[PDB]
Amino acid sequence: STTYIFGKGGALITYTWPPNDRPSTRMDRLAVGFSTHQRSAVLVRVDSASGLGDYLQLHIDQGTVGVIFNVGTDDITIDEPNAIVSDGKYHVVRFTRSGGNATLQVDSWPVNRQRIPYRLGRVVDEWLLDKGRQLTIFNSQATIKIGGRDQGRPFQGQVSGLYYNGLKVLALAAESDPNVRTEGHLRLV
């Protein structure tokens, strides 16, 4: 696992697909480990090419993980309101999108009366029961931006082992892949 520390003042890791083979997908799969004391941050954002409305965004609002996405139609929110993640401890998020449906999993190891921190998984599913086929495709994904600096909501804390549709974006940043740029106050562990 590759780990980055996002320090004070923000940082940005950006993966840019080659402009002539940008993926379009029905299903997206995001995994990421992190720790932060922030109650409000953007962690990951995938943007479609300019001129398209499509995006995927992983964030923390009021101390809980949520994902908001748009594949052409409406903004779709899936939140995990029962897991506090802003305690400075390690959490793992797993997000799968399928059309306008999504699964959001948040793993934690809570110490609570003090106890042995066995794992507590919390999964949320979100389905759209709309007769006929809706807009299901995330079109021409252009950038994955990690650290929230371009949303004005900079992440501060650790990020570990990010995985998005096959890409281990942090392993590629650490090895200086030509499609990754790293900026700001960032350090590799």
Ligand X SMILES: *[C@@H]1O[C@H](CO[C@@H]2O[C@H](CO)[C@@H](O)[C@H](O)[C@@H]2O)[C@@H](O[C@@H]2O[C@H](CO)[C@@H](O)[C@H](O)[C@H]2NC(C)=O)[C@H](O)[C@H]1NC(C)=O
Residue 104 is a binding residue for ligand X (CB under 6 A):
no
x-marked contacts with ligand X along 131-150 as a string, rule CB under 6 A: --x--x--------------
Q: What is the DSSP string of 4-33?
A: EEEEEEEEEEEEE--TTS---BSEEEEEEE
* Sequence positions preceding breaks in the chain, C–N over 2.5 Å: 112
Stretch of residues binding Ca ion (CB under 5 A), selected from 28-36, 109-117, 128-136, 147-155: 128-136
- Which span sits near ligand X by CB under 6 A: 46-54, 58-66, 81-89, 121-129? 121-129
* 109 counts as binding ligand X under rule CB under 6 A: no
Check binding of 103 to ligand X (CB under 6 A): no
Token reading at 83: 């897991």
H or E element that contains 173: helix 169-174
Is position 96 an interface residue for ligand X (rule: CB under 6 A)?
A: no
Tokens 């793992």 found at: 92
How many residues bind ligand X (CB under 6 A)? The answer is: 8
The span from the CA of 62 to the CA of 81, in Å, is 9
Choices 15-23, 38-46, 47-55, 155-163 (CB under 5 A): range interacting with Ca ion: 47-55
